Assembly symmetry: D2
Homo-oligomer: 120 residues x 4
């Protein structure tokens, strides 16, 4: 699959993931520093039988921003595809939703994009 291992995005975030045989993604998401207060559980899913025509491998995962040290009352989902090779990449778009009151729900969700590589 090529997905299991450590990945790094353009802002230094570190994505430590295992791609299980039946489509599970499990691991930890942390900052470049890696201190415990910066580490969070992640879980997701990937296509464990991708096409063989040169297409990428679809995947997604979620981090809720709560750990044993802090709680930002929010969660991010990344949706994207893995592209293999010597310059392997995971190319994603993400949504970060915070818990809000109904009056503030219109501004609950940020959108962005992250690219991950196997090299810092």
């Amino acid at each position: 699959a090529g997905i299991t291992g450590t990945w790094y995005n353009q802002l230094g975030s570190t994505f430590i993931v295992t791609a299980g045989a039946d489509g599970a993604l499990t691991g930890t998401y942390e900052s470049a520093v890696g201190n415990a207060e910066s580490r969070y559980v992640l879980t997701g899913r990937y296509d464990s039988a991708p096409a063989t025509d040169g297409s990428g491998t679809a995947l997604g995962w979620t981090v809720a921003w709560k750990n044993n040290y802090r709680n930002a009352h929010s969660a991010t989902t990344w949706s994207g595809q893995y592209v293999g090779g010597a310059e392997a990449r995971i190319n994603t778009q993400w949504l970060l939703t915070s818990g809000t009151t109904e009056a503030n729900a219109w501004k609950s969700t940020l959108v962005g994009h992250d690219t991950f590589t196997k090299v810092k």
Copy 2:
């Protein structure tokens, strides 16, 4: 009362979820739209200790659209919040990314919004 239960979106998709004490979401999703049949595995995360100021509970989950019957070579993530009440609701926005070639990657990702209720609309 809470996130654990059976939910339906505005199109009649069925979201059967369990919210574990450790912040885990697990369960199955059945889509009313697209190249999909029967149940698919989902996993995700939710805030197990939400704020006490009237705010909703943040959460997210992923389905990869492969099961024993079909494989669409794609995955959806839903990002949103649970809002308690007499008509409990989960309001989400979603991203659906297909595996593509690089030349087709610009059109790889659909976006939308789904609202879920424990009463089927």
Copy 3:
């Protein structure tokens, strides 16, 4: 075309628009003069006649003669005619930020507009 006129979203905003013969959208977006802003956009002036909606989009930059939020919203969507006509949209709201804060510069959401408030 059915687009020209006054529209109301789900949260009390008012969208006043003219759909010109050349594909232009022009008008004002509100929420009193302190809360009114120019909008401009484009729509498909020759949509299909097969039950499909009419694609369109517009932008508001949140500056007027009284206030300036240093931000701008774009709405992308389609007009759906009939007895209960609608403009169904998704939107992106980008703020001007420093580079260090750019990762959190953009909100996303959805607005539904009706011809009755």
Copy 4:
């Protein structure tokens, strides 16, 4: 500033004028999709940005109809202009097609484009 000729990462050409009243006007030539030749664009920008180093917020729309083709669709780009040595406009976009109600769930694509003064 914003007025000039810009190119996205895929080679699309964005020829824009930023007027004194906050107006964006010009033409767009897409490098992808059911598109050919130039299309009209209109939009808006913040004509009095902050003076603290922040970017200038802006947005614009293209409806994909011209004298040669009609894709029955429209794209909006929302983003900010970042001045300096190599000026850049960083955007996210939404591309909605006209659909029936039963197909509306798949009506909207999302992505991100970055524009510079140099061809990629």
